[PDB]
Amino acid sequence: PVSLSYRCPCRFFESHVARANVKHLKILNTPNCALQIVARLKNNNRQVCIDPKLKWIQEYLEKALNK
Amino acid sequence: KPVSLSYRCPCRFFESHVARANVKHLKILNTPNCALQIVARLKNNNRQVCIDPKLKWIQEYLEKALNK
Numbered sequence: 001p002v003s004l005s006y007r008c009p010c011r012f013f014e015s016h017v018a019r020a021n022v023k024h025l026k027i028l029n030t031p032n033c034a035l036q037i038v039a040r041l042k043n044n045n046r047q048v049c050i051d052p053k054l055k056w057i058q059e060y061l062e063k064a065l066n067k
Numbered sequence: 068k069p070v071s072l073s074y075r076c077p078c079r080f081f082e083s084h085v086a087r088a089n090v091k092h093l094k095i096l097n098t099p100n101c102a103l104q105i106v107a108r109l110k111n112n113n114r115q116v117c118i119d120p121k122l123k124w125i126q127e128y129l130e131k132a133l134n135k
């Protein structure tokens with residue numbers, strides 16, 4: 001089958017994930033995709049794509065970086 | 068050690084020469100007790116390595132993911 005770009009592993013996102021329920025975030029190197037952010041959740045150990053506009057993500061990433 | 072028994076921060080060492088093009092993804096650990104929270108999974112060899120948070124391209128990489 002023909003493919004016209006690399007597939008985006010994230011097609012849908014969750015908007016109601018809390019920072020406290022995240023083991024880690026993964027930021028996928030898929031810059032042409034709208035959704036690059038995955039969370040692995042603490043309560044069940046599953047991965048979900050998450051809303052990149054969640055304000056807590058920004059402070060989470062700033063703290064990781066400004067070290 | 069199993070993780071359940073580990074008190075050590077996960078990243079012992081970091082790498083400063085990881086090219087953006089060789090990164091499958093960055094994993095940002097939720098470990099505020101620790102200095103190094105950024106792990107890259109590499110495309111060419113599939114290793115996970117901790118990376119220097121001052122690596123040149125990381126900030127722009129992360130900002131682009133957010134700015135959609």
Ligand SMILES: O=C(Nc1ccccc1)Nc1ccc(-c2nnn[nH]2)cc1
Binds near residue numbers: 082084114
């Ligand atoms: O392989 C790497 N590290 C490692 C850690 C423990 C044991 C053996 C090896 N690092 C690595 C970093 C960057 C690149 C690379 N190639 N092109 N762009 N980045 C390849 C390997």
